[PDB]
Copies of this chain bind each other. A is one copy, B any other.
Amino acid sequence: ESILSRFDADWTASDEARREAKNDLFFSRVSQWDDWLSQYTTLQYRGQFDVVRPVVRKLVSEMRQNPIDVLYRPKDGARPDAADVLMGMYRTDMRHNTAKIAVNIAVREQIEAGVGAWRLVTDYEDQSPTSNNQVIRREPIHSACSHVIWDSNSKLMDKSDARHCTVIHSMSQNGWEDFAEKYDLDADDIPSFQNPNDWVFPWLTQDTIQIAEFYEVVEKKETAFIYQDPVTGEPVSYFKRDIKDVIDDLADSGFIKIAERQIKRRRVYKSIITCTAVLKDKQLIAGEHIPIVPVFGEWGFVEDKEVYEGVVRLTKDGQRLRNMIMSFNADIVARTPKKKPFFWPEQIAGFEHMYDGNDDYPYYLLNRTDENSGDLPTQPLAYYENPEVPQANAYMLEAATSAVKEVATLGVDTEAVNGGQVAFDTVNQLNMRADLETYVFQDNLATAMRRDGEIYQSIVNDIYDVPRNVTITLEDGSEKDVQLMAEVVDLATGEKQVLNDIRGRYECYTDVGPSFQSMKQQNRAEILELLGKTPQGTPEYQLLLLQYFTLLDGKGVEMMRDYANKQLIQMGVKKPETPEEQQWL
């Protein structure tokens, strides 16, 4: 079977473990806790000098300067149905605390540390009583760095990859939690793992031993519309194709274009196929959309080795001098053979009374007479203990300063229009990602069995098809003005329950560019160094009245356009949601 190896696809990092596969934390862990791997005759005090994170988390303030807040892109695209009140259903992104920090916690994947296992509100259908069309958005996680590695293409969101490779509610004893609340197995799985123990045992907890699973393999539906080989019995009639250009029309020999197909067919799938594995029937829902998956930082790789570049590169090197003034003091005060007076300790032989401070000052037992020394003075004034006293301290901190400020530099800017834009900030333009893309491109999951009065009330559409005349109500009575009444018009009703492709919709997405919000931010006027906008003109009075009505997010805003009916009706710019109007005078 050609599937003989999926073994070496994903976790192949276990094959490269000889040297580099442990360095994922070598870009991170060297800051916190232990640092020096080289042994080499050094003493204990360590770990309290680190000084890394300030530049790391100072980037949190540098994440979002541009507001990065717009959505739904108004324009004239399509048939007049749902677009008047703009969003009529979901404000729900601004509803919940975690949802408006969802973008803010989403900007925290771009530098930080490794990305871990993923979970949403324990999967699906747990909360939000609703029309099933959508629920809010996915929730990111914390920590879980060094456990797994993902290699297929694994750069940016332009890729189509095997759907939902693995998704884990990870490492808690209650952590199995509700994923077994569909149907309970033993509730326990127990794969047996391994690490470089290295026969050491300062540490105890060995437990990983949890669930890792698969979704679907190879291919799902190909479009590949085929009308061909009708004669001869359709031998090997299935085929695939790239370009449609020059074939033109063969129809002289055949029929015309009416067909339907079977998109539901068995195809052989062996997934992980662990030797001892089990049946695992029916985990999936109607194909389509499961917005679980993130995007990663963008860099080119020299080898199959992962490429990632952090700040630590310099901070792990040029900071040795900062502790050299420490590197000396520790052991020079740890040895300390109690520096002693000399040349009149010839009676130094041990006493008791002397150590107390002896407020009687003269010790007054001494002698000058010595065994023959010849002629000259002898001077034991020389070096015995001297401190560090390095002479270069002046310019060192300026060199290392220039280095650290070489690293800490991002987008040096002054004021006004210069802007705070950085590539790390540009990946926040795409941080909408999974949630919207999946149900805007693929819309099936829905309640939405309704048409023409749920199409069993369709009797309401019977009007004039009968030969004789029922129509044309008598003139302009107050009898019936009421809404939802049939007179003449026929309806095409609404779209069929979404088949995942029709355009004129896709009316709603983000406009990236100037930060201008829904109502009148930059388009109205502007923020940068200026004053006194309103110019001179007669109609610019009323056209200035049109300017500042602004927000629909308020309370009495519905009075706004309801104020437009006055002798001010002369304008004629009034086109609100109002059903009828044509009111007074």
A380 proximity list for chain B (CB < 8 A):
344
A142 at the interface (CB under 8 A from B): yes
**A429 and B97 form a contact (CB under 8 A):** yes
In the complex, the chain B residue whose C-beta lies closest to that of A327 is B333
**A510 and B97 form a contact (CB under 8 A):** yes
Binding-face segment, A226-234, A306-314, A350-358: A306-314
**A101 and B300 form a contact (CB under 8 A):** no
A567 proximity list for chain B (CB < 8 A):
570
Those of A154-179 within 8 Å (CB) of chain B: 155-158, 160-161, 172-175, 177-178
Binding-face segment, A121-129, A205-213, A266-274, A478-486: A121-129
A155 proximity list for chain B (CB < 8 A):
139, 142
A110 proximity list for chain B (CB < 8 A):
310
**B96 and A158 form a contact (CB under 8 A):** yes
**B104 and A382 form a contact (CB under 8 A):** no
> CB < 8 Å: which of B143, B512, B559, B584 contacts A100?
B512
**B158 and A139 form a contact (CB under 8 A):** yes
> CB < 8 Å: which of B156, B309, B570, B577 contacts A111?
B309
**B160 and A174 form a contact (CB under 8 A):** no
**A332 and B341 form a contact (CB under 8 A):** no
**Size of chain A's interface in residues, with CB distance under 8 A?**
94
In the complex, the chain B residue whose C-beta lies closest to that of A567 is B570
A338 at the interface (CB under 8 A from B): yes
A11 proximity list for chain B (CB < 8 A):
none
**How many whole Å from A105's CB to the nearest CB in chain B?**
5
**B342 and A131 form a contact (CB under 8 A):** no
Given the known interface contacts A96-B158, A137-B158, the answer about A101 and B430 at a Cβ–Cβ threshold of 8 Å is: yes
**A384 and B341 form a contact (CB under 8 A):** yes
A35 at the interface (CB under 8 A from B): no
A509 proximity list for chain B (CB < 8 A):
95-96
> CB < 8 Å: which of B173, B338, B502, B577 contacts A331?
B338
Those of A497-549 within 8 Å (CB) of chain B: 501-503, 506, 509-510, 512
> CB < 8 Å: which of B97, B151, B174, B429 contacts A153?
B174
A147 at the interface (CB under 8 A from B): no
**How many whole Å from A506's CB to the nearest CB in chain B?**
7
In the complex, the chain B residue whose C-beta lies closest to that of A141 is B155
A7 at the interface (CB under 8 A from B): no
**A310 and B111 form a contact (CB under 8 A):** yes
Those of A546-585 within 8 Å (CB) of chain B: 556, 559, 562, 565, 567, 570, 572-573, 575, 577, 584
A399 at the interface (CB under 8 A from B): yes
In the complex, the chain B residue whose C-beta lies closest to that of A384 is B341
A139 proximity list for chain B (CB < 8 A):
155-156, 158
> CB < 8 Å: which of B138, B173, B178, B344 contacts A151?
B173
In the complex, the chain B residue whose C-beta lies closest to that of A127 is B158
> CB < 8 Å: which of B160, B300, B584 contacts A572?
B584
> CB < 8 Å: which of B328, B384, B427, B503 contacts A101?
B427
A31 at the interface (CB under 8 A from B): no
**A160 and B126 form a contact (CB under 8 A):** yes
A102 at the interface (CB under 8 A from B): yes
Those of A296-338 within 8 Å (CB) of chain B: 298-301, 309-312, 320, 322, 325-326, 328, 331-332, 338
**B158 and A174 form a contact (CB under 8 A):** no
A102 proximity list for chain B (CB < 8 A):
156, 158
> CB < 8 Å: which of B172, B243, B325, B328 contacts A338?
B328
Q: 0/1 per residue, A88-126, Cβ < 8 Å to B?
A: 000000011110111011100011111000000111101
A383 at the interface (CB under 8 A from B): yes
A458 at the interface (CB under 8 A from B): no
Of the A-B pairs whose beta carbons lie under 8 Å apart in the complex, a sample of 8, sorted by A's number, is A98-B158, A106-B300, A121-B158, A123-B243, A139-B156, A161-B178, A342-B344, A572-B584
Given A96-B509, A97-B429, 15 new contacts (CB under 8 A): A95-B506, A97-B430, A98-B156, A100-B512, A101-B426, A102-B156, A104-B156, A121-B158, A130-B502, A139-B156, A139-B158, A143-B300, A152-B174, A161-B174, A331-B338
